[model samples]
Target: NLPVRSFSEVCCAEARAAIIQMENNPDETVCNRIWKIHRDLQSSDLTTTVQVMMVYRFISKRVPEGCFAILSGVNTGMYNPRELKRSYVQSLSSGTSCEFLRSLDKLAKNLLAVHVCSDVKMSLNKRQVIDFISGE
Candidate 1:
């Protein structure tokens, strides 16, 4: 029905890219970068966004221009919203995760409290949220 869907699903993709990338490059250098990047990322810390940044440093040479769009293509394409959420859940949303739910809990509460609109249409192409989720 659609080519891509859901923001968490995108991060769901990133988590794997990190795993496989870690698996492929199993050594001190990779760990150090992940550590350094994760530490730096932790200070400003969006959790999965931290994970996503490590991937950026790992895959890109200096700046990310070359691989940015390349990775986004794969990120959006390969994301499986179920497995990461499933294993991480250890739990349930419409095949998403706790990452999705916690954020959503805030938004859902506010929207209902405000009661501003009958519906809010959230679409990927409509927002930069995909980058927010997967950071590709």
Candidate 2:
């Protein structure tokens, strides 16, 4: 259970490694990188931002500029509406793995307790996420 202060490194490394694998087909280096992300995300108890970060990191290079929009609003702070909360939870649970849910839940609760309202919203295109999951 290693801990990293920054999420960017993990995201970038995974993206680069994935590129190598897709280009070379079944490369050990690429597989190792992907395996690391899977293992780390699985073991992690808090996932929201990290899960989103890795997903974005992997697909960003492939996606067009401004393809994904960061969701923000009046509810960006502690004033989030109940509807927003419900939708966010549903989206996370539906699109991500159980590990991601736990991580995000823990992270959100911890931050909210301290009155930190740093909620973020972003996702890869639906087609892209589906393709990634389907190995397409």
Candidate 3:
């Protein structure tokens, strides 16, 4: 339900190299697309051990210091950090709510927030701004 589709599953290495080269100038569409890939993965199929570790590794590779901060808790001998990350990603995927509509709205809002924050706009009307910032 959380959009598991990737542009090219086997091309992750190519994506990695492109991101590494373009990340410094985040304006490049390629860089933003690459960022979205990782961010989307964070909320996607985290239940799979490989997927979970892949997301962790991808983030760690691109943003080592930020990745290290999250991983630091693991080195400190507390599984809570890992557990918390798992829980967050799981929630992002199959959100639990009694009402289907409510669950849909919740998921949509969160996804929209991710997209909105990543978008850049020089100018927009108040309504357009609200819409741009809105999730769901």
Each candidate's number of clashing pairs is 0, 5, 0
Each prediction's whole-model lDDT (CA): 0.35, 0.35, 0.31
Query: Which 10 consecutive residues of model 1 have the lowest summed lDDT?
Result: 110-119
Candidate order by TM-score, highest to lowest?
1, 3, 2
lDDT of 1 at 25: 68
Best by TM-score: 1
Off by over 4 Å in 3: 1-24, 27-61, 66-79, 95-136
- Model 2 per-residue lDDT tens digits across residues 1-136: 7442222233334344433443354344443455345434433322232333334344333221221122221133554445444544565557653333243444343232112122334343433332222221
Q: Please give the RMSD to the true structure for each candidate, in Å.
A: 16.1, 15.0, 15.6
Angstrom error at residue 86, model 1: 12
Error of 1 at 124 (Å): 23
Global lDDT for candidate 3?
0.31
Ranking according to lDDT, highest score first: 1, 2, 3
Q: Write the per-residue lDDT of candidate 3 for residues 45-132, one digit (tens) a residue.
A: 2112122223223333332112222222123332233443334345434542222223333334333222222223212223222222
TM-score, cand. 1 vs. native: 0.24
Candidate with better TM-score, 1 vs 3: 1
Poorly placed runs, candidate 2 (over 4 Å):
1-32, 35-38, 41-53, 56-86, 89-106, 109-123, 126-136
